[PDB]
Amino acid sequence: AAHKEICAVLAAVTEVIRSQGGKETETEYFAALMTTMEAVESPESLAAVAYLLNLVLKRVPSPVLIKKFSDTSKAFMDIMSAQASSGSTSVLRWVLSCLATLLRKQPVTLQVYHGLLSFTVHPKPKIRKAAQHGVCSVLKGHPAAISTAKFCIQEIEKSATTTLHMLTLLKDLLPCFPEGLVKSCSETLLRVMTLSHVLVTACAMQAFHSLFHARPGLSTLSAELNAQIITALYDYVPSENDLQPLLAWLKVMEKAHINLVRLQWDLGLGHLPRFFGTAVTCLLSPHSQVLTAATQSLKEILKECVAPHMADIGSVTSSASGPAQSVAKMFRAVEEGLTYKFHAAWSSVLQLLCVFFEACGRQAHPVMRKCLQSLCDLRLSPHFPHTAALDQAVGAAVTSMGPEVVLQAVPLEIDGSEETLDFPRSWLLPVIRDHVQETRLGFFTTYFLPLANTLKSKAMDLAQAGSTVESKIYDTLQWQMWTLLPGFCTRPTDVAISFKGLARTLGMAISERPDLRVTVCQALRTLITKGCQAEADRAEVSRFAKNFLPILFNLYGQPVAPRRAVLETIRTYLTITDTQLVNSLLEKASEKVLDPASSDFTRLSVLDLVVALAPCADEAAISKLYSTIRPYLESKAHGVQKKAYRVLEEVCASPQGPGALFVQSHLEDLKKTLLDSLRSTSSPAKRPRLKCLLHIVRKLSAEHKEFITALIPEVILCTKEVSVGARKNAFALLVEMGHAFLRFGSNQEEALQCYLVLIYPGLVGAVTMVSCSILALTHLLFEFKGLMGTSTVEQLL
Amino acid sequence: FLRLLLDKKYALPYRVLDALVFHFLGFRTEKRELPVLWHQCLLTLVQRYKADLATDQKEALLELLRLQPHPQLSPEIRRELQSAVPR
Amino acid sequence: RVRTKTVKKAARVIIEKYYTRLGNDFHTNKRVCEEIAIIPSKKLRNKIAGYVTHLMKRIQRGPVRGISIKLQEEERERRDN
RNA sequence: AGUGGAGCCUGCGGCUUAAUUUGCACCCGGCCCGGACACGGACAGGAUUGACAGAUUGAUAGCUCUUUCUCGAUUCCGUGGGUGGUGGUGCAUGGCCGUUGUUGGCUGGUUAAUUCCGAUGAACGAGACUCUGGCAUGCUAUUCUUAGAGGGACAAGUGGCGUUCAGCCACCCGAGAUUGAGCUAACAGGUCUGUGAUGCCCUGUCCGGGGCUGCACGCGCGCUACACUGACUGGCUCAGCGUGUCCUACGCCGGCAGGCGCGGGUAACCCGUUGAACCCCAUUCGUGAUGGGGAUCGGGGAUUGCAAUUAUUCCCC
């Protein structure tokens, strides 16, 4: 009942009682209670003052502590001597605690440290735990490390239940030790590994874990000493399947090998292949946890200890000498781990091969093909459950290795005329489709163009000969291997020289080959989306855009077709092209629209091309286009008005460039036109127009309130428009428009009150517009939540 | 407890009877549905101590019967009140 | 929109019996949906067409060996009758 | 291949028995308590309550048999074909559970160990039911009004996030990428102290001992054998399904049942490379109710349990 009180020692003693007399802190209380700690051995009152001085002592009286450390120390030695002669627990525990505080804050100091250290092997748990935590706090808060390390070594050498306590001591104190004492302790823990007891083994592996986990410097652990620990600790390998010490063994090996690689990378990579061989050998254990631990261990070692230093290693062949030969041994071990003897860990082994592919395929390509052939042979099993894992492995191998080297290793047997029709390597084309990202395009040309032409001709010849079964198979084959082009256009390295060899091919395949067209369009888009990083590449793409653009325009404008993919390709491929040909095509499209001898479908297609060409032109072309499209906003055709409003939205969409300059030059004319054409706007045309209005809100000046208060009812009636897109646009326009009133005045709340009282009459008129205005207030209430002012909200409620 | 202690049939003191009739007058204008056992308690009281009830107590229990009736046991209380010989 | 059971099981069986006559785009899927199955509900026919378009854009990216043996099995079943 | 033959064991009948329970229920003894209503009796001359000691008892005991000390209306005797209440049971009956997503947040002793016991919070969202609209310059008596049918939209396409598949977001086109109508509910699982002067039918606990097939017989499952394709003795060499904080390794003692100590195993880790039996090899036995066959008996030792007697079980002769 009294411990939980705020006035008790739980909270307030730690805060306000440390200020002894108003100033923190004074040890005059401590020095005044000497008459209680002398000649009085009463329990439960010594404990209380000991607890109080333990809590008070932490608030740094450091120069006073340095001065009267002798007084405190002699007081403490008489306290421990009297209490050890008496045999109590609580008073000893907090006098150990205040020893910890005093020695952390600060010849006789070694004596105080020895007195604190000597009570650790005391059989009472409360004395021992407090002594352990105190020594840990003193050392980590060092000239006293040698003494406590020698004490621990002699305590082990003299000695069966205190060994685990002082192994926990060594576990918590190994990083803060000098190198010779670390070597002596390593010898001592190996000497206790000479025994067969399990708990001492687990605690010594935990000590080695805490040593290798902290990543010690050169003064604590050297590379030679780490190598000696690694080679000396190989002697145990408990049996194969113990599962309690094996995980700790693998754990200290990964941490020791990581530290060895961090100290000296060539020596660590030299010692690693034996560790990989032992890991592969212990993958035969029947326990799944050993498999998971080994998988994670070898994966993280390959990710952190091998991959960043692989570029320094360079290319490796079959006749390597240095660490490249070590990498060859690494791969030899993990490839010998692909045999039949596992047959249950093949998912983990395939994960290891996949991460090794991703780490080192590009620099290990000469020697790394035999395992590719072996895993190709593994997929020929009648019932393989790791088909997805094997496919991911081949995908990583294609990504890093490159499909040219893979096809040198495992060639496709679909080269022209086959006697059978049961393709055993038909998964390679989906793998190459899914996982080519960084391979040269010239390989794709010189290997996949004539083969595609011959198989397509063979499919046509078999279709015209009556056989409709094999022809469909060959058509599916060729259509799948034409989908490799988006993969090869991901990050090409020679697209500055190899794109010239595919320009006319892609032109004819997009003109008179419909079955490829979408993919070709996608390929083009995919290329742009990650291929215009350099400048010569973009120059080549523009130089061929001057040829592709009439072809794409004629493809989109033809009567009936994948018009939307062509439209998206045209949009991006016009955003990456030069402005003069944009102006020329804009002139041609304006001539085609203004020509009265064109059909309605052709007119709408050329208006879509005008929509595409609008944001990429200069200010004069955009201005003359706006002058041409301005009478079209009052047209009775809903499609023409919709395309006109989409043009006005697209030219106002650019935040910078000629479009923004055009808007800044023609804002008044745009406002008058949009207010005049408000009376004659069709129902679909509301959906783009609001966005156009949105595109002139977020830079609207302060002298434009009449335009906004004229636009209010249109925005509300579009918040309850038929189309959900128009509703979303009107809601976003309301949010941005309320944001626009957050810039016209100093008081945000008053401005939003004005914005509300501009829309408050909407709760008065016709039933449908009342519902419209309630929906508008519902949307506005969720965005500017507190800024309306709750009482006003209450009135609305 | 009321029903069984009235079934004890002891010589009832009259302050006790005043307390009981004061309790039943306390149950005058309540609209809660009284149980069948409430009417059983009333029946036991008017069976045992009908002679010790004065005329005003008789009529007071009469409008207590009127406002809080029972389709089954109220006529029994009616005939016990109407055939009661006072002291 | 979430998916049901009947549309997709009907799509699965209609592929398992007539995978040869399907196409790649939505309109050909619609056309084979009228000309193969009666499908009195127009909503169900539209959903079947959408899911079979999803199936044709999904399975055509896979291995060709399974497609080839499935065409052999379908041609054998057609020739047997 | 047998069973039906023989010995033993067991299941139904039957026979004995106090009981040999039945389709711990059984038996032999000893405790505890067992309405009010009506009427007639005793009752402050005292109704009735508690009690030491001794004894009866297989044992002790104010729960009994003596001897008087106390408490006093808190009462106790008898007769009713009169109800009945700590009763059992069904119905209507009111409340209450479970049922048909998402993101956060240490005084004490004790152990190898942040080991053990011991004191000791928040928000966000929520029809996958049926029908169906926008646009038709199309068919029908038809671009402006009609009303039948046929189309059209299905997340179909794009880019991101995604277990790379379910799904999510945004966008182009498109009239339509979701606008309108109808549908909470349900308890054969129930629960919780309330309502009907609710229908019915009546007015045991603990303790000690025994028995639980005791055996003339009838009807049936089984085990072991009637031997030479065998019994004894030694040697040799092979499993599998499972289980285990009672399975057990190992060392010592005893000839054997078995004791003592010290380890492993919460388990493909230890028993356990499960060193099994038939079988194989070698010895003795010689057609003899015999070295085949083992029942029933006499003595001794050990183990499990409060307890082994009517033999719990095991070992030896």
The ranges assigned to domains in chain C are 1-60
Angstroms from A563 CA to nearest CA on chain C:
13
* Residue B84 and residue B51 in contact, taking contact as beta carbons nearer than 8 Å: yes
| A479/C60 touch (CB, cutoff 8 Å), yes or no | yes
Angstroms from C47 CA to nearest CA on chain A:
21
From the list A234, A210, A224, the residue with the least C-alpha distance to A263 is: A224
Those residues with Cβ within 8 angstroms of residue A500's Cβ, 6 or more apart along the chain or in another chain:
A540, A544
* Residue A420 and residue A413 in contact, taking contact as beta carbons nearer than 8 Å: no
In the structure, how far is the CA atom of residue A94 from the C1' atom of nucleotide D108, in angstroms?
15
Residues linked to residue A20 through DSSP beta bridges, in sequence order: A23
Cα A473 to Cα A363, A421, A476, A666: the distances in Å are 37, 9, 5, 60
Among all protein residues, pick the one whose CA is nearest to the C1' atom of D114.
A129
State the nucleotide closest to B34 in CA–C1' terms.
D195
State the nucleotide closest to C47 in CA–C1' terms.
D154
H or E stretch at A675: helix A667-676
d(CA C65, CA C71): 10
Q: Is the Cβ of C75 closer than 8 Å to some Cβ of chain A? A: yes
d(CA A611, CA A653): 12
| C64/A426 touch (CB, cutoff 8 Å), yes or no | yes
Cα A286 to Cα A242, A246, A291, A352, A665: the distances in Å are 10, 13, 9, 19, 78
DSSP state, residue A16:
T
* Residue A95 and residue A79 in contact, taking contact as beta carbons nearer than 8 Å: yes
Interface test with C, best of A387, A433, A434, A469 (most C CBs within 10 A): A469
| A430/C68 touch (CB, cutoff 8 Å), yes or no | no
d(CA A20, CA A23): 6
Looking at residue A67, its amino acid is K
The technique by which this structure was obtained is: cryo-EM
Listed resolution, Å: 3.0
* Residue A429 and residue C62 in contact, taking contact as beta carbons nearer than 8 Å: no
**Distance in angstroms between the alpha carbons of the first and the last residue of chain A:** 48
Which of chain C's residues 40-79 bind strand D, using a 7 Å CB cutoff?
A: 41-43, 46-47, 49-51, 53-54, 57-58
Structure tokens at A269: 């990579």
Q: Is the Cβ of C63 closer than 8 Å to some Cβ of chain A? A: yes
SS3 A135: helix
* Residue A126 and residue A161 in contact, taking contact as beta carbons nearer than 8 Å: no
Could you tell me which chain C residue has the CA closest to the CA of A484? Answer: C61
Give the torsion sign (CA, A126, A128, A129, A131). positive
SS3 A209: helix
In the structure, how far is the CA atom of residue C41 from the C1' atom of nucleotide D294, in angstroms?
88
Those residues with Cβ within 8 angstroms of residue A414's Cβ, 6 or more apart along the chain or in another chain:
A423, A425, A426, A451, A455, A477
Those residues with Cβ within 8 angstroms of residue C46's Cβ, 6 or more apart along the chain or in another chain:
none
Looking at residue B69, its amino acid is P
Structure tokens at A153: 């070594």
In the structure, how far is the CA atom of residue B3 from the C1' atom of nucleotide D166, in angstroms?
71
State the nucleotide closest to A203 in CA–C1' terms.
D112
A611 beta carbon to strand D: under 7 Å: yes
Find and list the nucleotides of strand D having atoms within 7 Å of a protein beta carbon: 36-38, 107-115, 128-129, 131-135, 151-160, 164, 166-168, 170-179, 194-197, 264-265, 268-269
| A476/C61 touch (CB, cutoff 8 Å), yes or no | no
Residue appearing with tokens 């990498």: A327
* Residue A366 and residue A405 in contact, taking contact as beta carbons nearer than 8 Å: no
The contacts found for A171-174 with CB under 8 angstroms, 24 or more apart, are A171/A203, A171/A206, A171/A207, A171/A209, A171/A210, A172/A132, A172/A136, A172/A210, A173/A135, A173/A136, A173/A139, A173/A145, A173/A148, A173/A149, A174/A207, A174/A208, A174/A210, A174/A211, A174/A214
How many other C-beta atoms can be found within 10 angstroms of the C-beta atom of residue A660? 16
CATH class for the domain made up of C1-60: mainly alpha
H or E stretch at C51: helix C42-59
